[PDB]
């Protein structure tokens, strides 16, 4: 008897690969940038959960 | 033989466009690099 996790209720968002925040380049650092409509957010690939972008959430290059 | 070719055509199409959860082929390859151990910016 196998117990498994099944995602559901997909919703579409606008996404970008990188962000600047000040004339720079920042990458999600194991995440993805999503545009909700009010501002950009960082979230997991499963179970959408808005988080405000921050230096820790990203690595600069 | 045609039916088998239909199955393989759909498998490649699903790989190249993705429950579906569609995602661009670029952000997907960046995700793969994470599993390898390399950084996405590379």
From Swiss-Prot, chain B:
Top-level taxon of origin: Viruses
Function: Acts as a viral fusion peptide which is unmasked following S2 cleavage occurring upon virus endocytosis.
Protein name: Spike protein S2'
């Amino acid at each position: 008897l196998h117990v498994t996790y099944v995602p559901s209720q997909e919703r579409n968002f606008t996404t970008a690969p990188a962000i600047c925040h000040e004339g720079k380049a920042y990458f999600p650092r194991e995440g993805v940038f999503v545009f909700n409509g009010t501002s950009w957010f960082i979230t997991q690939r499963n179970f959408f959960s808005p988080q405000i972008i921050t230096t820790d959430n990203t690595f600069v290059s | 033989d045609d039916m088998i070719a239909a199955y393989t055509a759909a498998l490649v199409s699903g790989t190249a466009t993705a429950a579906a959860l569609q995602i661009p082929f670029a952000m997907q390859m960046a995700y793969r690099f994470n599993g390898i151990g390399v950084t996405q910016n590379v």
